[PDB]
């Protein structure tokens, strides 16, 4: 099963999938992801879209 990245949309306040052409067309509410630990450093992450 392929996992696609999800990005927050400030205008509608929902986690909407990137990769519009070939991807899931579902949008999830906030509170799905709750952050309480230290985040991943920006240097390690790879940029997509």
């Amino acid at each position: 099963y392929r996992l696609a990245p999800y990005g927050f949309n400030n205008k509608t306040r929902r986690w909407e999938c990137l990769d519009t052409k070939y991807g899931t067309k579902r949008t999830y509410q906030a509170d799905i992801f709750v952050a309480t630990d230290e985040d991943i450093p920006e240097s390690e992450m790879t940029e997509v879209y």
């Binding site: 927050f8 400030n10 306040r13 906030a30």
Partner: protein, 50 residues
Amino acid sequence: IAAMYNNDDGATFQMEIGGIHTNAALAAGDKLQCIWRYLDVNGNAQAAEN
């Protein structure tokens, strides 16, 4: 209420409260109820409670 409007944040929105007696304070987690009227996207007035 006076005014209410949204914020650029993901979560919150801003609200004034108007005339209040001096000996009063608010703590986080308090709940407020109101019946207010807004303008729909189509341009028609509506009413709601929250």
